[PDB]
Nucleic acid binder design. Structure first.
Lengths: 58, 65
DNA sequence: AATAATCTGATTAC
DNA sequence: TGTAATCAGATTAT
């Protein structure tokens, strides 16, 4: 059993897309700042970027 | 580029983690979350620990074979 | 130099 | 769906 899929809101997604434009590989401080800003865990942020790098590469 | 500092597990947390690994190498979300409570580690660190644990297991086996 | 953290590439599951 | 979650495998780097 997997954790239940997070459903990112559009305001959350906008914050993450803007950060992605600054860097596709944010460091720990940047990922934690974002998590705090979006009420998400650094882990979900890390996974969003991982998947967002995938799609872009694909 | 800064990464998260290495987390250091206590002998107590390490014992709890390995005994869980012995019961199960692919702990579901509930298990990992339970483990997190017991040990006081975040579940994110637990998932990473199991990942690295399964990899130590695989490397040892290939090595000795 | 052992292993926590990060990445990609495939894949699952919803 | 498209995409969030997971995994193995490889690697970085404390």
């Amino acid at each position: 059993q997997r954790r239940s899929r997070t459903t990112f809101s559009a305001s959350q997604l906008d914050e993450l897309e803007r950060a992605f434009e600054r860097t596709q590989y944010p460091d720990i401080y940047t990922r934690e700042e974002l998590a705090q800003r979006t009420n998400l865990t650094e882990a979900r942020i890390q996974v969003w970027f991982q998947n967002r790098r995938a799609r872009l590469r694909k």
